[PDB]
UniProtKB/Swiss-Prot annotation, chain A:
Gene name as annotated: TAX1BP1
Classification of source organism: Eukaryota, Metazoa, Chordata, Craniata, Vertebrata
Subcellular location: Cytoplasm; Mitochondrion; Preautophagosomal structure; Cytoplasmic vesicle, Autophagosome
Region of the whole protein represented: 15 to 124 of 789
Protein name according to UniProt: Tax1-binding protein 1
Function: Ubiquitin-binding adapter that participates in inflammatory, antiviral and innate immune processes as well as selective autophagy regulation. Plays a key role in the negative regulation of NF-kappa-B and IRF3 signalings by acting as an adapter for the ubiquitin-editing enzyme A20/TNFAIP3 to bind and inactivate its substrates. Disrupts the interactions between the E3 ubiquitin ligase TRAF3 and TBK1/IKBKE to attenuate 'Lys63'-linked polyubiquitination of TBK1 and thereby IFN-beta production.
Effect listed in the UniProt record for changing residue 100 to Q: Complete loss of TBK1 and RB1CC1 binding
Species the sequence originates in: Homo sapiens
Written domain comment of the UniProt record: The C-terminal UBZ-type zinc fingers function as ubiquitin-binding domains.
Length: 110, 115
């Protein structure tokens, strides 16, 4: 609950860029090797990612603050419509998960 | 029959990839294969005869907590400076065991700006 994923949909288009919004809550200090992964549900460790992007250190970070971030994942790194469920996970520089979103599928929407 | 036997299946393989951006290659180990530290995935021009014909390659990392008979998802990132540029040729991924045998191959693709 230390990193909250925001406005997470139930599905995302497979071949378009995805915009991942999240909040660095007061309960965590970011670190420049932190990253966000797209993980298939049922994952055990942080090495089980499908794709990832570095979460860039917030400019002029003041401790204990509340910061909202955006990451655009490119469509050609996203899964296809494979019926599987994926989620977002925030991973720190060491490898602890401190954020995990509701699941979602890549496919056309309702 | 067909070749190679599909002991490794490449997943979500696109029709084309960016010439100068890294690509992320996804494959699954089937219950037929027991992976080995010297297995690798190569990018091969279509029409390859043996594992010697590769364009570029990476070692396939040995999966953690490996249990025989399992289906295992893997991913490799090939750097763009090791990828073919827009040469009009067709390529595929192939999984090659340490015994030097091709045990999986993907659908073909070329390196160019996407449609």
């Amino acid at each position: 609950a230390h990193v909250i994923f925001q406005n997470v949909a139930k599905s995302y288009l497979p071949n378009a860029h995805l915009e991942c919004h999240y909040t660095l809550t007061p309960y965590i200090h970011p670190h420049p090797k932190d990253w966000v992964g797209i993980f298939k549900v049922g994952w055990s460790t942080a090495r089980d990612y499908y794709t990832f992007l570095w979460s860039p250190m917030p400019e002029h970070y003041v401790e204990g603050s509340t910061v909202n971030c955006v990451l655009a994942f490119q469509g050609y790194y996203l899964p296809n419509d494979d019926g599987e469920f994926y989620q977002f996970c925030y991973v720190t520089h060491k490898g602890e998960i401190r954020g995990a979103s509701t699941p979602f599928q890549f496919r056309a929407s309702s």
